Swiss-Prot record, chains B, E, G, I, L, M:
<dbReference type="GO" id="GO:0030257">
    <property type="term" value="C:type III protein secretion system complex"/>
</dbReference>
<keyword id="KW-0653">Protein transport</keyword>
<keyword id="KW-0843">Virulence</keyword>
<keyword id="KW-0813">Transport</keyword>
<dbReference type="GO" id="GO:0005576">
    <property type="term" value="C:extracellular region"/>
</dbReference>
<comment type="function">
    <text>Component of the type III secretion system (T3SS), also called injectisome, which is used to inject bacterial effector proteins into eukaryotic host cells. PrgI/SctF1 forms the external needle filament that protrudes from the bacterial surface. Is probably involved in the transduction of an activating signal, thought to be mediated by the distal tip of the needle filament, to the secretion machine. Required for invasion of epithelial cells. Required for the secretion of the effector protein SptP.</text>
</comment>
<protein>
    <recommendedName>
        <fullName>SPI-1 type 3 secretion system needle filament protein</fullName>
    </recommendedName>
</protein>
Curated annotation (Swiss-Prot), chain D:
<comment type="subunit">
    <text>The core secretion machinery of the T3SS is composed of approximately 20 different proteins, including cytoplasmic components, a base, an export apparatus and a needle. This subunit is part of the base, which anchors the injectisome in the bacterial cell envelope. Forms a stable homooligomeric complex. The complex is composed of 15 subunits.</text>
</comment>
<comment type="function">
    <text>Component of the type III secretion system (T3SS), also called injectisome, which is used to inject bacterial effector proteins into eukaryotic host cells. Forms a ring-shaped multimeric structure with an apparent central pore in the outer membrane.</text>
</comment>
<protein>
    <recommendedName>
        <fullName>SPI-1 type 3 secretion system secretin</fullName>
    </recommendedName>
</protein>
<comment type="similarity">
    <text>Belongs to the bacterial secretin family. T3SS SctC subfamily.</text>
</comment>
UniProtKB/Swiss-Prot annotation, chain N:
<protein>
    <recommendedName>
        <fullName>Protein PrgJ</fullName>
    </recommendedName>
</protein>
<keyword id="KW-0653">Protein transport</keyword>
<comment type="similarity">
    <text>To S.flexneri MxiI.</text>
</comment>
<dbReference type="GO" id="GO:0015031">
    <property type="term" value="P:protein transport"/>
</dbReference>
<comment type="function">
    <text>Required for invasion of epithelial cells.</text>
</comment>
<keyword id="KW-0813">Transport</keyword>
<dbReference type="InterPro" id="IPR047754">
    <property type="entry name" value="T3SS_SctI-like"/>
</dbReference>
Length: 88, 78, 46, 51, 78, 59, 78, 88, 78, 59, 59, 78, 78, 78, 59, 59, 46, 46
């Protein structure tokens, strides 16, 4: 059987830091499950055999790999622009 | 729980696609070995040995093809 | 209450024949294939 | 449904002449089922006399 | 039900093409062994035995060909 | 939906592994499916690599 | 629409390239199996079997050549 | 039956900012279609099984690699020329 | 434990399928060699020599068939 | 626990390397353990490599 | 236009797959088309890798 | 100490699954080459030489599938 | 101009090496088929049919050798 | 028989991480000097983990010291 | 100049493909040109690779 | 001292390069010696590569 | 309390034959196959 | 106390032959296969 969750929860924001913190929390929840569900796809060894679920597990690597690499370099440049201006 | 993969199910379809050929090879040997001079038994035994030969050959070549597909993809992981 | 019912339904669906011999005596016909040596043709009735 | 998932090809019938009988095998309804066939398979035949 | 492949079915077509010739050779043989000096019975048995020799020989070589057809293609899988 | 018509010819060979015409059609199918799977894997592969080259360039 | 590739179309071209080889093997065998002692049927059946033997062997060998050419190209993508 | 368009229109630039918008928008459409060209070449499965069409798709991949790699390094060396001048 | 492969056990079934054929060919020869002109002894020796000829040829050719089946599988290991 | 039922099926093939049914099941087993092990090697490798890339950026 | 005289010789063998002169001539065609296509595949390959090496050099 | 590895495990696993084939082919070469015409000895060694060929390729091709995987690990070292 | 390769030119040396051998086999068959009991026609046909067999076999094997020579250099391109 | 036994914060941290990086060096040194541990695949996998966590551990305390001392120079030059 | 006496023995065998002495010298010839050609291809390849490896180090 | 008990099996095959039992044991040696040599070279390499990265960081 | 009960229930399910010979004497029929040589056709009663 | 009981319980689970010849003399029947040459059909008694 399958099960989807229709209700998504939301909270009001008043300041600017919590808007930053929900991207911080939103990225931490994405990587903590997606590091694991592809390993659960790897540790279940019937999922590593069928070519259908092999090709989606092929591309799920690239979905995980390009995402974490984008938020690294954007933050590297983002903290790099604050570095140079205060050094002047 | 004894695990069974996808490669098990393709090879299991050869096992379930034929009903009792593992029995039929065994059954054809005992009737032939009791009296290896019956012409009715000789024509039946030529068919079953050759059927069991194509059975295992069809099993082994199919698994080799699906084996080479995954290894090209796993190499294409990194 | 919601997280209990969903996780108990998807653990019940994952959890979810004997041969036997019968002896029947016929009453109006022989058994087995017959051959009829009527010397015009070896006729068989299966 | 799983006992109604019996193969028709899993039916095995053998003759046995010295008691004029058939030995069949299967699950608990198809032995009863093909009983209905063989009870409608041997009727008492009729005689015809030529001259 | 005893399973039967296509190679079983080709050899069965020779078996059904004659009705009960395997029976008819033995029955013609049984009348011959009681009195092996009747020329009408000898000429009848010469015809049926020679018919039976070509029966099994034509059956067994044709099935061998269909074995070689399947084995050449299955070899070309991988 | 190609994997569907992959999965319909092996069972007829499972029921009959001696028909010469059927296994010929099956060989033309599964080897053609062999050409599709590595095609999808090799074509996504360059798109990861060239996308990784940009971040390797801009770092 | 059920898909058929180009390699299917190459193999389909063999199927339309010969007119009635699937019929000719079955009809010559059925007339031969009814009476397997006719020299007119023996010479006819030898002819029909050999055309089907070279047909399938040429079919199976043809798909293998176009496959390894393609496999050499797919490796040279990345 | 295929089609080509023959008119390459010209709108006047009022500044350099108006110039850069055409070179980006003229390239963003072109970089979207060719990647969508190679998938529909792939997603049509009758195109990838023929020997003659494979070298066509072989050519269109390698041009796509050489195109976007050539625009990346120039912009990299372009902004690299900016960093050195501002540092001086 | 005396090791026995699968091919050893099939060939042993032929040896047990006949009761004392290894003894009887040598023993029928010994009764024949004392007086090789008795028609009751000649027809008995004709039967045992032709049975022993067909016995070893069908046994030895059968192991050859099972040999080629395994080697096709063993080649498909790597 | 896949390696357990790998290490239990080779010995009957060791005792009987001529059973036609057993080595067919053994090849479907042994090639399947081959595809699993390098998959595990390749999947931890990317998780190390992308983890090495962050320290490569901040150094 | 090589594929034209590729696609013109199979049909006489399709209508008559037992003529000894044609399949010998057919084999002389098809191995050369086998030799031509990967040659084209190998020649585009050197032009991509050495062109990728230049941006690899200047990056 | 005479040291053993995991590849030495599986090779000697073949040597303990079999018992006497490294010497059972030696007693039949003494036997068959003594009188090189006996049918119970010709078929004796043909059941011995044949099983010697499957067992030595099985202990060999197991090594190659078990080497390159350990190559694939060390390939993933850097 | 219809293009002809080197493998065409090697086969052309076979084509020019025999003058009218494709004609000579057909004409020798036509004289034999009119009266297939003439020893002068039988002896002429055994020579001409067997020469065409060695003609094509030497022709077909030569293109195969030059093919594997060509595949090793093209593989050594990249 | 197998056995098992059971048993300023910066001044304990640098001394604590002193032998914490030393014993993982020595345990992979004799992992690789022992040849029994380098042949099994699943022992290679846990050493592959053991190599990789060695690189991430000592590199994390390297750069954070570098960034730790990278924060000190600018304030003192001010 | 080996290719000359390669190209000189096939034609006399073309006019007479049944002389036993000629094809024996031809087989000793024709198999030898096969051994010569791949020798030249494999030997330039290492000389390309070793010439490419030094610039591969300094790039 | 692993190379010692490698180098002690070459001589018995040198006197007899046709014994089936010796080359079976020798392949089990030499492939295992293949696994030993490159593993040790690659593992010292990481111990080499990471210490230079520190001085590259601190310079 | 919960971590003990779940762990000690999934370790009981993960925790969960001799042949023999019988001799039967018949009373109404022989054993083994018999043949009836009625010289028209070799009839067998299994 | 817990680490000793656990480790010494799993080490009794990992912890946890001579042939012989018998001669039996029969009393009511011969040994070995017998043949009954009743010259109508080769009957065998194992």
């Amino acid at each position: 059987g399958q099960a989807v969750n229709i209700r998504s929860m939301e909270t009001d924001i008043v300041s600017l830091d919590d808007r930053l913190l929900q991207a911080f929390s939103g990225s931490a929840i994405a990587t903590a499950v997606d590091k694991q569900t592809i390993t659960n796809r790897i540790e279940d060894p019937n999922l590593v055999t069928d070519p259908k679920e092999l090709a989606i597990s092929q591309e799920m690597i690239s979905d995980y790999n390009l995402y974490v690499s984008m938020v690294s370099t954007l933050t590297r440049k983002g903290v790099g622009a604050v570095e140079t201006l205060l050094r002047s | 729980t004894p695990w069974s993969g996808y490669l098990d199910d393709v090879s299991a379809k050869f096992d379930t696609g034929v009903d009792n050929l593992q029995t039929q090879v065994t059954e054809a040997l005992d009737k032939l070995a009791a009296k290896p001079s019956d012409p009715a038994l000789l024509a039946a035994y030529q068919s079953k040995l050759s059927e069991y030969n194509l059975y295992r050959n069809a099993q082994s070549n199919t698994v080799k093809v699906f084996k080479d597909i995954d290894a090209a993809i796993i190499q294409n992981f990194r | 209450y919601v997280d209990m019912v969903v996780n108990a339904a998807t653990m019940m669906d994952k959890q979810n024949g004997r041969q036997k011999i019968g002896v029947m005596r016929l009453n109006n016909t022989f058994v087995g294939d017959r051959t009829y040596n009527l010397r015009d043709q070896k006729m068989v009735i299966p | 449904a799983l006992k109604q998932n019996a193969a028709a090809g899993n039916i095995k019938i053998v003759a046995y002449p010295d008691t004029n009988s058939l030995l069949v095998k299967g699950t608990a309804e198809q032995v009863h089922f093909i009983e209905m066939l063989v009870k409608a398979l041997d009727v008492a035949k009729r005689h015809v006399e030529l001259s």
